[PDB]
Amino acid sequence: APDEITTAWPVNVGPLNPHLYTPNQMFAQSMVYEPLVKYQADGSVIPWLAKSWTHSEDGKTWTFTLRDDVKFSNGEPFDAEAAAENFRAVLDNRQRHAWLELANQIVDVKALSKTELQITLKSAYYPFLQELALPRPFRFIAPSQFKNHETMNGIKAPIGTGPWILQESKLNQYDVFVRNENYWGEKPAIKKITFNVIPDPTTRAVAFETGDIDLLYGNEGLLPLDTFARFSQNPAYHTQLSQPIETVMLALNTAKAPTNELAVREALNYAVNKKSLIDNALYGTQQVADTLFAPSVPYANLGLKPSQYDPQKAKALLEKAGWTLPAGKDIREKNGQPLRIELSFIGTDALSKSMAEIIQADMRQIGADVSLIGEEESSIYARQRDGRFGMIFHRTWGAPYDPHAFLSSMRVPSHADFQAQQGLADKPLIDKEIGEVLATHDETQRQALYRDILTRLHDEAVYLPISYISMMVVSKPELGNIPYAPIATEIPFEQIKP
Ligand SMILES: O=C(O)CN(CCN(CC(=O)O)CC(=O)O)CC(=O)O
Numbered sequence: 001a002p003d004e005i006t007t008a009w010p011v012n013v014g015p016l017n018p019h020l021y022t023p024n025q026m027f028a029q030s031m032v033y034e035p036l037v038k039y040q041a042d043g044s045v046i047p048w049l050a051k052s053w054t055h056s057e058d059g060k061t062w063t064f065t066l067r068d069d070v071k072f073s074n075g076e077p078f079d080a081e082a083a084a085e086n087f088r089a090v091l092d093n094r095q096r097h098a099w100l101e102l103a104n105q106i107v108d109v110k111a112l113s114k115t116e117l118q119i120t121l122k123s124a125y126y127p128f129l130q131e132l133a134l135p136r137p138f139r140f141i142a143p144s145q146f147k148n149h150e151t152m153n154g155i156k157a158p159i160g161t162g163p164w165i166l167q168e169s170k171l172n173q174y175d176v177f178v179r180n181e182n183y184w185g186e187k188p189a190i191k192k193i194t195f196n197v198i199p200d201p202t203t204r205a206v207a208f209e210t211g212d213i214d215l216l217y218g219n220e221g222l223l224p225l226d227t228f229a230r231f232s233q234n235p236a237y238h239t240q241l242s243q244p245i246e247t248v249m250l251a252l253n254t255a256k257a258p259t260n261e262l263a264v265r266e267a268l269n270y271a272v273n274k275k276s277l278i279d280n281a282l283y284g285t286q287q288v289a290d291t292l293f294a295p296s297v298p299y300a301n302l303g304l305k306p307s308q309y310d311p312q313k314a315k316a317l318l319e320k321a322g323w324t325l326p327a328g329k330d331i332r333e334k335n336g337q338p339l340r341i342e343l344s345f346i347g348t349d350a351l352s353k354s355m356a357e358i359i360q361a362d363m364r365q366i367g368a369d370v371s372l373i374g375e376e377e378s379s380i381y382a383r384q385r386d387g388r389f390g391m392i393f394h395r396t397w398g399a400p401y402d403p404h405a406f407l408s409s410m411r412v413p414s415h416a417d418f419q420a421q422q423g424l425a426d427k428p429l430i431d432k433e434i435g436e437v438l439a440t441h442d443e444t445q446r447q448a449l450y451r452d453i454l455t456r457l458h459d460e461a462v463y464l465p466i467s468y469i470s471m472m473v474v475s476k477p478e479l480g481n482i483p484y485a486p487i488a489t490e491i492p493f494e495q496i497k498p
């Protein structure tokens with residue numbers, strides 16, 4: 001069947017509530033649900049469910065003109081009432097969306113007619129349109145499928161306007177999607193997509209080698225990277241590696257001994273041989289990261305000075321800070337206290353473990369004792385939210401989140417970044433400036449504020465950037481060239497064209 005494919009995902013796609021997070025998978029929410037405006041790789045948006053829009057001079061009131069020809073997959077019309085009901089349903093759960101500042105800025109949403117939708121904002125929020133473009137939460141389910149006139153407590157059928165329809169889901173086995181034959185836009189070439197639930201990366205590679213699946217698409221965790229490199233040379237297969245999409249880093253706890261000392265954080269940022277780490281654990285497949293955001297990220301080409309691998313310098317910094325080696329020991333001490341740092345990661349994630357072992361080795365060579373704390377996912381996320389870590393693996397979010405949304409979220413205390421930053425004298429100023437940068441319409445001031453925030457974060461050595469990672473593809477050749485989505489968390493199945 002040349003227009004049916006089988007792929008894999010580590011978990012089910014979830015219930016496909018458009019307005020909720022885990023266990024809903026973003027790429028799948030994006031398959032069914034659509035936005036008012038669609039994000040493009042150049043950073044702009046184009047008309048989508050909204051054909052056009054205007055705003056007020058003060059930038060607080062926006063009026064969208066909607067398409068008039070869009071139906072939900074169940075035949076019900078998409079109109080301004082439906083869109084307004086969705087916004088209400090999202091904002092009824094406002095607390096859950098704190099990380100996204102548009103959810104705090106929207107003050108009112110109302111359908112002025114079937115085709116006119118008015119959105120009012122607290123302030124002149126510059127990332128407005130890009131945040132409407134996101135996979136979640138501002139996309140649209142048929143209001144008939146609300147439960148008790150809400151979505152925050154669940155939905156009935158996951159009815160969107162999008163090019164794919166969920167056919168069926170079987171927990172821990174598979175999810176099947178079919179093409180929407182009444183889609184308002186271009187019809188996908190592919191008719192059916194089956195997602196086999198395959199949690200282990202090795203098991204995913206095996207499934208591809210046996211012919212059980214036709215396509216694997218995902219980030220650096222998709223399959224073992226040595227196997228990837230092998231497949232890349234195998235003439236029976238097709239593989240791809242995108243340009244980098246986001247940063248993988250450690251976050252260092254500025255509020256916990258001994259990472260509360262700037263000098264210790266500086267030393268750590270000279271201690272890791274990142275090129276080696278990438279060649280060893282990532283099989284040469286990713287790029288070295290010197291800064292939180294790659295220089296290609298909007299607002300982030302700042303000429304920030306890299307801390308290159310330099311164990312001599314790391315040891316000098318620590319000696320100067322009073323962290324010195326006792327007679328016959330390899331671990332430094334200050335005030336009888338050992339230089340001991342806990343590194344938390346997801347313990348069943350083989351790649352993270354491999355990286356953690358490398359980081360531990362490199363840091364031992366400069367007299368820091370890194371203890372590896374590998375735990376289940378829920379325990380790691382809990383550590384991130386409450387700052388119970390020394391160092392922790394973390395990542396940025398990709399386009400169109402990076403940098404404005406990721407920075408916005410640094411203000412939210414129940415996220416790793418806030419927690420890592422909590423010990424900085426200038427954290428309140430950073431948070432103030434993050435608030436300002438998002439509202440400011442003076443473009444000169446906006447660049448200054450991004451420079452200031454990112455520069456403080458860099459100079460304070462809050463992070464240990466490791467790698468700018470890429471999306472990876474393995475496919476049967478008959479599927480052809482597999483496109484990448486502008487939005488880093490989306491999978492553009494509708495663009496596959498054998
Ligand atoms: O996952 C969440 O609950 C919310 N996200 C907000 C950022 N997300 C977008 C999302 O979940 O909608 C980025 C991402 O998950 O890549 C927090 C996080 O991932 O750290």
Ligand SMILES: [Fe+3]
Nearest residue numbers: 021022026397
């Ligand atoms: Fe998220």
